[PDB]
């Protein structure tokens, strides 16, 4: 009987652990599993400065809890070193942690305020202005579409490119200025987020 050392048995050590960035602080993200053939009392730990800022471990149960919010937009992959000890040996093993994205950002407009002077004789179909908004979520969640709320019979906006065109003959005498509201939305399937911006069009 030399001491048998314990070993982790979590399947994730072979692959990776996926954790959603909306996991709340204090939630349990997994439970460490280890075996010691002596059946020695085991003590679980986390090691690393980076890792111990984000996770804590219950020492007897091996429940791993989140210490502070994950943010997929800041950091989407961590390497975490976990430890298990029988008080004669500290065994360590690394897991790759993958942060899952949620749609948690609305689009942000750039180059505001938006304002453009055009002559009353601007032909139909003429491009007059380009709005721009960006959105750092993954995938459909980060893909911006533009529209006018509500649509205008005098101006259209290209949904993908944010280019404003004249679609109706203008008339200074009828209308001197339009205040349009541009909606930029992401395309998240179930929880789209959008944001509004003002576009002033001044007729000459």
């Amino acid at each position: 009987q030399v001491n048998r050392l314990p070993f982790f048995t979590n399947h994730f050590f072979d692959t990776y652990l996926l954790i959603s960035e909306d996991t709340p602080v204090g939630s349990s993200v997994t439970q460490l599993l280890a075996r010691d053939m002596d059946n020695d009392p085991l003590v679980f730990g986390v090691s690393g400065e980076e890792a111990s800022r984000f996770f804590a471990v219950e020492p007897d149960t091996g429940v791993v809890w989140l210490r502070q919010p994950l943010d997929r937009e800041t950091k989407s992959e961590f390497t975490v070193e976990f430890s298990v000890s029988d008080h004669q040996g500290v065994i360590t093993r690394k897991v790759n942690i993958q942060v899952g994205d949620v749609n948690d950002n609305a689009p942000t407009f750039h180059n505001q305020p938006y304002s453009v002077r055009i002559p009353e004789n601007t032909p139909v179909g003429t491009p007059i202005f380009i709005v721009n908004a960006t959105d750092p979520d993954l995938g459909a969640g980060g893909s911006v579409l533009y529209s006018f709320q509500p649509p205008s019979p005098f101006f259209a906006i290209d949904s993908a490119r944010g280019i404003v065109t004249v679609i109706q003959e203008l008339d200074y005498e009828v209308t001197q200025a339009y205040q349009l509201t541009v909606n930029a939305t992401d395309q998240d399937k179930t929880r789209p987020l959008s944001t509004l911006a003002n576009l002033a069009i001044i007729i000459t």
Partner: protein
Amino acid sequence: DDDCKLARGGPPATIVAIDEESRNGTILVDNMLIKGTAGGPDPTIELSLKDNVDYWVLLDPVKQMLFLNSTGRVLDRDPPMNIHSIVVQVQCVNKKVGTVIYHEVRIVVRDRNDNSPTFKHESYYATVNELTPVGTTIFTGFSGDNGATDIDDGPNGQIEYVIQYNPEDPTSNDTFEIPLMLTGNVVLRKRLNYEDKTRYYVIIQANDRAQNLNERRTTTTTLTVDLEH
């Protein structure tokens, strides 16, 4: 319409994993499952790779299949190459609307036990006083990184030292022991006698700690122990 959005359910990123040193042409992702067709008579979408740093990934847009491209090189997780993961974007352009969606792909690269321990020196040495009592530590030269080291990660890179039987010095593994294999310090187990024997050749084998015993790798050194007087 919805072309360029994911056809599958689940989260936005397409995350997969793969062992280091995998064959050229390994299928990383069998089907990206993006709505639309990049091929055929009337393609509704365009697919291409972005941020394909060093071209590790190749795309077939019609099948929406991603492949490892390692012809003439190896995907190495260990130093000096240190490839722990590969991130690419599958850019999808909706041809009709102009919409652009980036489908991020993340490839976790797993460590293989493909390296053996190496000892810093070709052999090691201690001198011992014949009256040194049993239980005394007589050699600590494997401390620091002056012993064996291994460039793999985790347990594949950790070391255990085990004295081996030596058919050229049958008594050496009786006279000395390593009680704590993770340290490799050698302790005197039997009384010495300068009148009978002045030198021991102790064979010390370093092994790494791979999960499975039969993928462990080992390396041998000799500790020569001279008695003083």
